Amino acid sequence: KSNERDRLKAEWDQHNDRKFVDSLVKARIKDAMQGFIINTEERRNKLRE
Amino acid sequence: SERFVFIAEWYDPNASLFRRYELLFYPGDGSVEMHDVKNHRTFLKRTKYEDLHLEDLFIGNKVNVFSRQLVLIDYGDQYTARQLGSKKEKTLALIKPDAVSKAGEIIEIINKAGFTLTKLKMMTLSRKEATDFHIDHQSRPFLNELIQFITSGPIIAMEILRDDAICEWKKLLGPANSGLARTDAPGSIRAVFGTDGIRNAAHGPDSLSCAAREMELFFPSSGVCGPANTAKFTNCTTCCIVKPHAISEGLLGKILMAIRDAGFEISAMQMFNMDRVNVEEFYEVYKGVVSEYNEMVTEMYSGPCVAMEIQQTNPTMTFREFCGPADPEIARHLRPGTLRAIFGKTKIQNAVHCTDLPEDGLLEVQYFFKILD
Amino acid sequence: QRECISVHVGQAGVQIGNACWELYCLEHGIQPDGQMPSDDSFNTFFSETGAGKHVPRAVFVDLEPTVIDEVRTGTYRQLFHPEQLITGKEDAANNYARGHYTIGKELIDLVLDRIRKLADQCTGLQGFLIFHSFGGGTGSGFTSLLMERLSVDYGKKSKLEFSIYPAPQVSTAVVEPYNSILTTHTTLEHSDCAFMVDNEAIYDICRRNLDIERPTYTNLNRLISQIVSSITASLRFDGALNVDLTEFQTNLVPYPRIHFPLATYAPVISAEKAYHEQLSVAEITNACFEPANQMVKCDPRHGKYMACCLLYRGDVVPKDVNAAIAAIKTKRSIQFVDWCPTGFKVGINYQPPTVVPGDLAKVQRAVCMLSNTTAIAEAWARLDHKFDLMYAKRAFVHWYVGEGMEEGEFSEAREDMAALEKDYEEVGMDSVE
Amino acid sequence: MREIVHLQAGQCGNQIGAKFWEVISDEHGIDPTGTYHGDSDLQLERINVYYNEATGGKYVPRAVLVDLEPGTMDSVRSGPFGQIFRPDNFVFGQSGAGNNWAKGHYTEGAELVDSVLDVVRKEAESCDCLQGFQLTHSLGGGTGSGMGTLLISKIREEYPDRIMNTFSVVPSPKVSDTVVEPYNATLSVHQLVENTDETYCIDNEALYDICFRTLKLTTPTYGDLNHLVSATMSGVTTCLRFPGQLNADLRKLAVNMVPFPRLHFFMPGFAPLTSRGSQQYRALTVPELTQQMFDAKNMMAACDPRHGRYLTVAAVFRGRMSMKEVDEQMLNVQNKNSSYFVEWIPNNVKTAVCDIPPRGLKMSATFIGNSTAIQELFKRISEQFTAMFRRKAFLHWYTGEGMDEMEFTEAESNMNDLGNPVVTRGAC
Amino acid sequence: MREIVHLQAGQCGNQIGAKFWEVISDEHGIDPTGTYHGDSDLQLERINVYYNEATGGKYVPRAVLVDLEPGTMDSVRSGPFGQIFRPDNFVFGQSGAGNNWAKGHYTEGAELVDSVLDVVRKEAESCDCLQGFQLTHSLGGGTGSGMGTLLISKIREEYPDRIMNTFSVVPSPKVSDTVVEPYNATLSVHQLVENTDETYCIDNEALYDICFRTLKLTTPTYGDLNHLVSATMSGVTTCLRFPGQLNADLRKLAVNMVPFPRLHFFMPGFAPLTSRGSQQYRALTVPELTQQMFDAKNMMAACDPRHGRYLTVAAVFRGRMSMKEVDEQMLNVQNKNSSYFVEWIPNNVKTAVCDIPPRGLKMSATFIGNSTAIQELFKRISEQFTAMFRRKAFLHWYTGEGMDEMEFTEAESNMNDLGNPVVTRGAC
Amino acid sequence: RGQCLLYNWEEERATNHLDQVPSMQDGSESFFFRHGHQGLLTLWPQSPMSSRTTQKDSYQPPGNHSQPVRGKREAMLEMF
Ligand SMILES: Nc1nc2c(ncn2[C@@H]2O[C@H](COP(=O)(O)OP(=O)(O)OP(=O)(O)O)[C@@H](O)[C@H]2O)c(=O)[nH]1
Numbered sequence A: 001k002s003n004e005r006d007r008l009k010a011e012w013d014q015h016n017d018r019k020f021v022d023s024l025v026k027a028r029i030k031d032a033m034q035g036f037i038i039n040t041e042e043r044r045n046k047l048r049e
Numbered sequence B: 001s002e003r004f005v006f007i008a009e010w011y012d013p014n015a016s017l018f019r020r021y022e023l024l025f026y027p028g029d030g031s032v033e034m035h036d037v038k039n040h041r042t043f044l045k046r047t048k049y050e051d052l053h054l055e056d057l058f059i060g061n062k063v064n065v066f067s068r069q070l071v072l073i074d075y076g077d078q079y080t081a082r083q084l085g086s087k088k089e090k091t092l093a094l095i096k097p098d099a100v101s102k103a104g105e106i107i108e109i110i111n112k113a114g115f116t117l118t119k120l121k122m123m124t125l126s127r128k129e130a131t132d133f134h135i136d137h138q139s140r141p142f143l144n145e146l147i148q149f150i151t152s153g154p155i156i157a158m159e160i161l162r163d164d165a166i167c168e169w170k171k172l173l174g175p176a177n178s179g180l181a182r183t184d185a186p187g188s189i190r191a192v193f194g195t196d197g198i199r200n201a202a203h204g205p206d207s208l209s210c211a212a213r214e215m216e217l218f219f220p221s222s223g224v225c226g227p228a229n230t231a232k233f234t235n236c237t238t239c240c241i242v243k244p245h246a247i248s249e250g251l252l253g254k255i256l257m258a259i260r261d262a263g264f265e266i267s268a269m270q271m272f273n274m275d276r277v278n279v280e281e282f283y284e285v286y287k288g289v290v291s292e293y294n295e296m297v298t299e300m301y302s303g304p305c306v307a308m309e310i311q312q313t314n315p316t317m318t319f320r321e322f323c324g325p326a327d328p329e330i331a332r333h334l335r336p337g338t339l340r341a342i343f344g345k346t347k348i349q350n351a352v353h354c355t356d357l358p359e360d361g362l363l364e365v366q367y368f369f370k371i372l373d
Numbered sequence C: 001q002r003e004c005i006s007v008h009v010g011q012a013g014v015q016i017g018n019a020c021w022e023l024y025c026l027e028h029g030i031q032p033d034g035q036m037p038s039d040d041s042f043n044t045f046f047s048e049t050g051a052g053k054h055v056p057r058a059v060f061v062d063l064e065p066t067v068i069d070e071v072r073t074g075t076y077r078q079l080f081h082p083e084q085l086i087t088g089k090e091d092a093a094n095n096y097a098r099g100h101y102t103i104g105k106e107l108i109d110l111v112l113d114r115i116r117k118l119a120d121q122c123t124g125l126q127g128f129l130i131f132h133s134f135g136g137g138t139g140s141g142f143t144s145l146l147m148e149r150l151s152v153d154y155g156k157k158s159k160l161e162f163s164i165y166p167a168p169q170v171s172t173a174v175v176e177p178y179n180s181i182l183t184t185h186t187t188l189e190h191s192d193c194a195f196m197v198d199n200e201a202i203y204d205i206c207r208r209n210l211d212i213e214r215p216t217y218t219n220l221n222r223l224i225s226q227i228v229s230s231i232t233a234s235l236r237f238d239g240a241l242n243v244d245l246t247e248f249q250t251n252l253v254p255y256p257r258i259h260f261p262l263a264t265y266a267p268v269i270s271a272e273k274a275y276h277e278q279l280s281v282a283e284i285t286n287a288c289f290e291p292a293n294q295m296v297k298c299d300p301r302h303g304k305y306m307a308c309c310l311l312y313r314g315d316v317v318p319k320d321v322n323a324a325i326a327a328i329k330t331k332r333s334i335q336f337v338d339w340c341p342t343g344f345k346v347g348i349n350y351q352p353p354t355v356v357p358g359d360l361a362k363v364q365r366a367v368c369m370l371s372n373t374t375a376i377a378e379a380w381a382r383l384d385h386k387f388d389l390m391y392a393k394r395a396f397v398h399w400y401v402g403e404g405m406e407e408g409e410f411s412e413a414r415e416d417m418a419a420l421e422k423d424y425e426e427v428g429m430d431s432v433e
Numbered sequence D, E: 001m002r003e004i005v006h007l008q009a010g011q012c013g014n015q016i017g018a019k020f021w022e023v024i025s026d027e028h029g030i031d032p033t034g035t036y037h038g039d040s041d042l043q044l045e046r047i048n049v050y051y052n053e054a055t056g057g058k059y060v061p062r063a064v065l066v067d068l069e070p071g072t073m074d075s076v077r078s079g080p081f082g083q084i085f086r087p088d089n090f091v092f093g094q095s096g097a098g099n100n101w102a103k104g105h106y107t108e109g110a111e112l113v114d115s116v117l118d119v120v121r122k123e124a125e126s127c128d129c130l131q132g133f134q135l136t137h138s139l140g141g142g143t144g145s146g147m148g149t150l151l152i153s154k155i156r157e158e159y160p161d162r163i164m165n166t167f168s169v170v171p172s173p174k175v176s177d178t179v180v181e182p183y184n185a186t187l188s189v190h191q192l193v194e195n196t197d198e199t200y201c202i203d204n205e206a207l208y209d210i211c212f213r214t215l216k217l218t219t220p221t222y223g224d225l226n227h228l229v230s231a232t233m234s235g236v237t238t239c240l241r242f243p244g245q246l247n248a249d250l251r252k253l254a255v256n257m258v259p260f261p262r263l264h265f266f267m268p269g270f271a272p273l274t275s276r277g278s279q280q281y282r283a284l285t286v287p288e289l290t291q292q293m294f295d296a297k298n299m300m301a302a303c304d305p306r307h308g309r310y311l312t313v314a315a316v317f318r319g320r321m322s323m324k325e326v327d328e329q330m331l332n333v334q335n336k337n338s339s340y341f342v343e344w345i346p347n348n349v350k351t352a353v354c355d356i357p358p359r360g361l362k363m364s365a366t367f368i369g370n371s372t373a374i375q376e377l378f379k380r381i382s383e384q385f386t387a388m389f390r391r392k393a394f395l396h397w398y399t400g401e402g403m404d405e406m407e408f409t410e411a412e413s414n415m416n417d418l419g420n421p422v423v424t425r426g427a428c
Numbered sequence F: 001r002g003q004c005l006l007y008n009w010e011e012e013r014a015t016n017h018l019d020q021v022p023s024m025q026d027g028s029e030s031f032f033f034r035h036g037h038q039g040l041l042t043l044w045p046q047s048p049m050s051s052r053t054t055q056k057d058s059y060q061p062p063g064n065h066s067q068p069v070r071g072k073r074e075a076m077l078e079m080f
């Protein structure tokens, strides 16, 4: 009972500690690629002109 | 009667399994038949088709019929295996560090005999690779001369095929000694474009056993050898593409002719086999811009093509003016002197693709000469 | 975190289990070697050791060789733990006495030891998935021993059967009417919910929709592997609505005796017809109610639906699901019992179904329906009548009674199945009070 | 938003529909692999008239392809645009058609009807607002006659408020490709009169007349014969798919072309028809196009329009043109020959002009004429039936499969009862 | 390990052993010397079942060859795979039965029966889960008929849990082969009905028909007829050896066939049997396999099922095949020919599939069936004893040997106490 | 051989590549073929065994073997 709650609490926070880091990295990488999307969009506008 | 059978795959844009089919070309009158291997039924009954030619039928070649694009993987049956089997021979031809100026003539004289062209590199050979290349004459008093010539200028490596292509390319080579070729005068590549028997124009394997090790040394299977002699950052740089069309009918040496006679400095060549997702990145700035982006995509990946870097010279006229407009029929009347004016037809099947926007220049150069081997 | 332990009994259950674990490997990206080509969704069916060697959370148990040896000689040799696989040395041979009473004690201690070893390294045990047949001696009696022990040891847990129901017309045995009544009588008290599956119903499904007039048992087993993949996926992936094994057993089971639903699937299309079809959520829901996509040969029009669970997976619009439910709650070909107006339970997952190299198609939508209906009394009555006509003058009784099993359990199982057939009728009867 | 369900009954109807789907897939920009490559975004506005969408943007035809012998389905599948159709809609049958209306209406044909109506009903239910059905078939012969007319009867029974278009091939006076064309065609017309709304009659000798005198060809093929019909079929339903001014759908064509409910027999026509030798010297304008339509050599049934009064005429132009040209040119036609137009219907011509032309071409026009001259095409078959029926010949098959002398006489009597008003309204 | 002993006794039975062990050596790999020059690696695994092991790849067969006169013993040592049977497992005695069950079960046998038992134990123990012995005797005649029954008996006790299958040569119908055959074989029937678990009756006469009608062999040798029996002796144990879906252990072929205990006299039969000349034209497919199996001519025992019925039947279909077919063709047989099937036991079949075809084939099957018509067989044999005992014929020996007139009677009744059960249920 | 158009002529002409052969002093037919012939089996008694069981033919090690839906410039961008 007590060790039963403790074990899954431990596993809970253990994969929390890494899902934290790589989710934040994924969000920042999405921001970087949408910045590059803005770059190629103005690039296309120049090509159209 | 007298039918030709091949086995092919097609990647369907829906469900991702490779559809396995059976292609059948009739040379008596140009007709296509396809059978299905998975379920033994019919597929596209025997119908006339005046866009498929005999030279397109080759192993590993990339053939388009009814927008259902095929790639060939087997020789059908033993009959056409005999007909186009021991015929085809793979050979590695080498432009020397000399006659790189007249590279187009040599590409053209391979193109004359029907020697179909599959891989193309322009590399400055490394120090370590030279002694691998010099196995044919190892430990004889010619290593210093042959090293000093070979590891001096950029060489151009060549994969070639036709029947008994070994001895047919030796027949283009003529005598091995270029001085002997001049004294004999048989109309060989050294007899027209040589200097001497250590710097002639071209020499490679003498048999298939040596052709195997030449192939492995110069075109590796995972790839490390050619240092990709491009000089990517050279400011006045432009990347253009001799299209899979112009490669298929065979215009590469003549394009090299037309561009070097204007003083523009060719700095890098490579043939790369286009795939769809990779064509999207080189033509990334075109979707939405041109209302027929899809035909440009399928013309790019409808076959092998050579990327090349051109260095800007010949003042006033830039490469955009040397190639002129986009459509060859725009260019035929308006500015009637461009390479896109008269070296190519239609609009789908143009000769070259330029960098269009200026800044957008080192990008292409990098794509096909840095971020893609 | 959220794991369910799979047990697979008999030659049948082991081959279904091999299909299930192949499809689980292709879902979670597990290669047959055991490693992963480099998220935590794999911790429902595959465990984790250092220097990653993800090992299945199952046991394949069988009383005779060549079936488990087929698995360890095949292409999944390195993936399975050696003691995970259990081999006997003497075949049960279609006898419930040789499944329950004589050769079960030579392996039940080792099987329970391995179940304990698996359950020790399992923080959340959402239940056991029991794959077995109502046919052979192993899958008939060894399962009865298994539930008898698991009711004692893990009595608060959930047990979900995926039984191979006997063929109502063709069959492969004469003692299936014996084995079916005996294992139903023993496992009726100890089961929580049992989805039954008919082989010749899947033959009809394959010949009509999958267009394979030459189907094998691998083709047969891959579809039921996809059934359990649809059912045990919400505790693996995330989605719109989360559904669990306990939630299944408490939604599909009105009465303690009545725990016999029927499984069915949608897109059963064969990779040359799935792209000329709209394949909308409404029509993949409508394909489940037709009396031809059912996995058991039993007409729903000859009965009343008591509960249904619709499990949707893929690019699924829940409001399109809701409109489909509103459309199918109107027509009079489908009737409910008068005491279950809220009969539909929805579970949506955000994972489109995978395909193995084989027979099914790339589908971006799928739905598995678990419909508990009183029509299955008709299918019970056929093998009930078979049991009467078979027991009229004591055919094949000598093996069972001489192996050690008492004679009176035939009458006990007969009366229990008669009581179950009696139990279904007033539940199906409309209320008048 | 409108949809039309396509049906092909018989071999002839099957190749005509195959060339139809090729031609309109060319016009809408559909590849044989199901995806889209095209040049105009105006083509996708009404793609859900003939094509139902699927997963991944793979447009499939809303067509059902039925025959009593599985030797035309594999030919259609092995055509260039073969695997665009739904394989469940390939409703075949391992039997023999036997070119017999009895075996198409009361035998294996009627046994296969109960299965083909399932996919017809599915294609009807998978639409928001269906408008019409179109059926490609041939009277002369079986399947397209027997199963075709029985499909017309059952679909009219199930959907009584929707337009029924039928593109029907009638036997020629020059030859006969079988020997039982009158026997099939009379029982065909007897069902087709009190059922469908727009019969469009096509004749093979008229096709050869067009292909030799107008188009100047020396070896025309069945691709050519069905291609003219495919161009007509695309140009009838084009105000509904492509935009413009004075749009006209099929029911508006029906209400402006059918004065009396039985009188719905039409002779189609397509007239930007240029030979290769005359294409360079051509002077393509609306004053040319109207004269080419009203020239009585391009009419795709072997009936002479100078032998009877036009009841109603409809013209669907396609292209950027002026309604000055259109309206006043069609008026000068009506005034140039007024004895060949009826007086009990004044201003008896209908104009519908699309903006989008057929691909490659600039100004097209499709002609549909309700006229008296269908009386020749019908009386001819009537005396052919009297000649072949006074001696009871070729009849034991019908009497064995379940036909009756009384209903054969009923079919002939109904053919005469429609030969009556075409003379009555032509002689006032 | 489920190993299987192959007790074989009697000149006749021993010849059957030879060709049996050939089929097994062939379907496995054991060469006429021993070294396993086997090709695939699915055959060397389950060798235990029939083949043992010995330092040097040598796989001495776990067989027990017995006889009462060193005659065939030697003819086995030298001939086919002779030099493979252990020199010790060739137990033999100097005398001769003489076609008299007596010497076989009381005087002669007694001497050898004791020693033969020793060989068995030395071999048995070695097996892990000894699946169970299997004997090839010769009711019609001596030695086996007598010695065999005595062994079957004494060994049924020592180990009271091992299916003792017995492929026996029951006296043929017409042409006889021994005058004492009647009396002799009857004694065996008695002993067999209450000692053996499941026997399979074979008639040399029956196989002759199957050899000059289904195999069109001009001059059939006993060796040829022997191969057919050997093949059945292989098909019944296929699963216990090679892999396969739906395996079938010997105990199962019984548990799913033998209804009441006593009733255990079936009828064996191979399946893919076509002329050595018309084989290249054979369309081997489940349909044709089941046709040639549940037929009649292709049954290795004179007992036309048509004149009788069928309690339960099995079909060990070896070969990679689609069970849908197996299942359906099986049901077709049951449904169509219902009369030739009892109703008290529903589902009267035993689909069992392997995964390895008999070397040089694709599919194959072995029909085993409890035809209630095995009565006609025991009837002939009984209508012979009562045709003899009555006139105290050829009885002196038996009596003088040690048997008692009374004993003979017991058998007659026991026989008719089995020639009757198979009728009560065999008519319902 | 058969050499006569009495009964069994077709099978007398056939199988002489198998049956009609035994040296010169082997002795008749029944004295040398007393252990049987190469019947039952079709015509190929040295054919190799099948080892292509259903588990191995239906559970082969799978793979993608498809074109990569991953641009190279993407691959460098997300990797960097
Ligand atoms: N999907 C699938 N179903 C099977 C398979 N094998 C058997 N079945 C079904 O199961 C029934 C009998 O199989 P089992 O209960 O496993 O037989 P068993 O438990 O191994 O017992 P024994 O026959 O004595 O070996 C058959 O009627 C089939 O319907 C299989 O390999 N795959």
Ligand SMILES: Nc1nc2c(ncn2[C@@H]2O[C@H](COP(=O)(O)OP(=O)(O)O)[C@@H](O)[C@H]2O)c(=O)[nH]1
Binding pocket: D009, D010, D011, D012, D015, D016, D067, D097, D099, D138, D139, D140, D141, D142, D143, D144, D145, D169, D176, D177, D178, D204, D222, D223, D225, D226, D229
């Ligand atoms: N326009 C056109 N007409 C055709 C074609 N093929 C056949 N026909 C006509 O169809 C008539 C016979 O068709 P029919 O026998 O009824 O086909 P069925 O309905 O399948 O039996 C012939 O007289 C032909 O003139 C075609 O490809 N195009």
Ligand SMILES: Nc1nc2c(ncn2[C@@H]2O[C@H](COP(=O)(O)OP(=O)(O)O)[C@@H](O)[C@H]2O)c(=O)[nH]1
Binding pocket: E009, E010, E011, E012, E013, E015, E016, E097, E099, E138, E139, E140, E141, E142, E143, E144, E145, E169, E177, E204, E222, E223, E225, E226, E229
């Ligand atoms: N199938 C088969 N039957 C045989 C063979 N040899 C003998 N028989 C049968 O066995 C019967 C007599 O054998 P028997 O005298 O009992 O031999 P014994 O056991 O040594 O006394 C004959 O009727 C034969 O038909 C054989 O090699 N194969």
